[PDB]
Design a protein around this ligand. Structure first.
Ligand SMILES: Cc1ncc(COP(=O)(O)O)c(CNCCCCNC(=N)N)c1O
Ligand SMILES: Cc1ncc(COP(=O)(O)O)c(CNCCCCNC(=N)N)c1O
Lengths: 369, 369
């Protein structure tokens, strides 16, 4: 990667904007790994994590399906050439106009966690196949989702009965333990709770057949099987039947390693032995994960330094006016100079999708390799 | 405002959330600025709200501009504003933005580092420089001191370095922090600015500008409070009484805050054990980033008329799949229904400028009144 980025810089000597270097082949290999790690689980890629059109086309061609959060994401996927039959509208709160659009296009599998959402379905998309999302938290997940989404255990039966009353077909149960989960027991407990909800749905008179284990998984490479082995044990313990279809909604598993982000030192200040640098990127650009996921990322220098190069205490600032916009508060690095380029590895998940134009910055290029 | 917004809805039988923006309000505030600060020329901080009608209103009312980047300079230049009315008030500017500023005739900028002076000498040697010193309001909403502004112990060195490079230092600036209600902070900052001003004279510069930065609110109770302006003017009298000194400021929120209201619709609802949870077609990743970055706890105004009606405990959620995305965790309101519109007053400062398209949301309209 150090070589590739350096070659891009030499081939494009007038490069000024920060730039993503994205590799479809990385994602292809990871899709193949998913197939091996989770042989029973059909991935519905969470478009919200990274909606890069080459990434989505790569997914499409590898027979990966899609989790869309809005009508805009549905449109993106359809424009790639994917059948709307391959989309789960996996957001429990959908606008009436988005529901009408989904019905029209052929997106007819969606999630819910409220009676009012069932009312909307009844009126606007009456034959949409529904998946009840239940709350099952991983308390150690990086981004918590439980307060806002998912039915509590005590309303499961009521919601299923209400769906039955409105002639709404409930076809399965989903959960999301939280974004950025490394807790295998959380998935085990979630899958157990899902079987209990599945059994309530059957009791009410539904004929469910889908388990949706949501997202949260990292592709941790040292590729580790701690998460997958235990998830598969839970699938075996609670959903052994070949009549059940299992799906997932991974975002970061595929998107994380898709891209690196290259950025240039544009300003510098050295005070009492502390080396402060300003980059043509920011927490309002590609680095929102510093704010929302507590990321503390270390860059790779593109300039070669000797093995014995002295590291100095460094502060990596974003380019905006704001004091909150600090990429890394403290990191030991070789001394950098205005004009040096660095890159941040594994910068494809919840990075480019969260860009703003705050302060008039936020621009970037994308190179595919 | 309630009838105005209802009128827009009746006139546009409208799906997206929308800003209702009033140039008159800003024109009136400009007239008030001239009364509150008769000696201070405002350079509006474009970053706060870059709406084109707002910028044109500023232009026509003889207000100047504080631009943070080349993109922002472009926005101002393209509406016919003389480059002489722009200060490039960012202490860390890319070489290519300086090149651009030089091309456009933007010939005044701030700095707080020796490396910045190196860049100026090489790329914009005619640029007149304003030294930004660090002077904090510890009670300001958004702190800036950590990241920007020269420390007291380096002021003389920085001025001597500019002199060695044949760079003209024409003044001193500070920013106590964004969202300041501490008059003492400004008094001390202006006192410190006069000390720096005298150091500049001692070194051989001929400074003539004091730039008091931004931070101020237009706090109204239909009369604007002078709690800040009176003491700022007192400090000006004490430390910069000379008519040979030009005083400027870089206000953002003072003019932008009250420029707009943001209307948004209830798109989802869930009532659980007496708690009323609502989902809106807006989010903290759309126009409500101030909930995250400024710890805003905004209360909406209902557009539907209610009888002098029981209030219930309500939670206002944003439309994204993130658990962080909560507009207001707890607010007492009359019961709302899917389809109800509400609006949020004084929603013009750091609101529309910070929109993302995360989850495929973030779209909005703008109506001018
Ligand atoms: C329904 C659904 N499916 C799949 C995923 C996928 O989760 P992942 O960890 O990528 O596999 C998510 C992500 N939940 C909001 C995550 C916000 C993260 N916000 C942020 N600013 N980084 C989701 O809501
Ligand atoms: C040089 C300069 N001038 C004027 C202003 C104007 O400040 P105001 O309070 O609007 O008058 C600012 C705002 N400082 C970064 C503001 C980040 C706020 N961030 C956020 N997420 N809201 C600034 O940096």
């Amino acid at each position: 990667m150090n070589s590739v980025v350096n070659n891009i810089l030499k081939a494009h000597p007038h490069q000024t904007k920060s730039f993503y270097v994205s590799s479809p082949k990385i994602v292809e290999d990871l899709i193949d790994q998913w197939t091996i790690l989770f042989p029973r689980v059909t991935p519905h890629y969470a478009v919200k994590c990274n909606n890069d059109e080459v990434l989505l086309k790569t997914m499409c061609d590898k027979n990966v399906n899609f989790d869309c959060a809005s009508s805009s994401e549905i449109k993106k996927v359809i424009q790639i050439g994917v059948s709307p039959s391959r989309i789960i509208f996996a957001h429990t709160m959908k606008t009436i106009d988005d529901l009408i659009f989904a019905k029209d296009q052929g997106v007819d599998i969606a999630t819910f966690d409220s009676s009012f959402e069932l009312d909307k379905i009844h009126t606007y998309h009456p034959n949409c196949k529904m998946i009840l999302r239940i709350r099952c938290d991983d308390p150690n997940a990086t981004v918590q989702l439980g307060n806002k989404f998912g039915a509590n255990e005590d309303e499961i039966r009521h919601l299923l009965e209400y769906a039955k009353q409105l002639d709404i077909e409930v076809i399965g149960i989903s959960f999301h333990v939280g974004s950025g989960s490394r807790n295998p027991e959380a998935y085990y407990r979630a899958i157990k709770s899902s079987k209990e909800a599945f059994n309530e749905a059957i009791s009410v008179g539904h004929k469910p057949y889908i388990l949706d284990i949501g997202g949260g998984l990292h592709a941790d490479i040292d590729l580790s099987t701690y998460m997958s082995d235990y998830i598969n044990d839970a699938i075996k313990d609670f959903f052994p039947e070949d009549t059940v279809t299992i799906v997932a909604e991974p975002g970061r598993f595929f998107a994380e390693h898709y891209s690196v982000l290259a950025t240039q030192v544009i300003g510098k200040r050295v005070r009492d032995g502390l080396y402060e640098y300003f980059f043509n990127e920011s927490t309002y650009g590609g680095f929102s994960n510093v704010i929302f996921e507590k990321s503390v990322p270390t860059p790779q220098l593109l300039r070669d330094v000797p093995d014995d190069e002295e590291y100095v205490p460094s502060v990596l600032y974003g380019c905006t006016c704001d004091g909150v916009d600090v990429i890394n508060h403290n990191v030991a690095l070789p001394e950098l100079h205005i004009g040096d380029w660095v890159y941040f590895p594994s910068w494809g998940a919840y990075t480019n999708v969260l860009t703003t134009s705050f302060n008039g910055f936020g621009e970037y290029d994308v190179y595919y390799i």
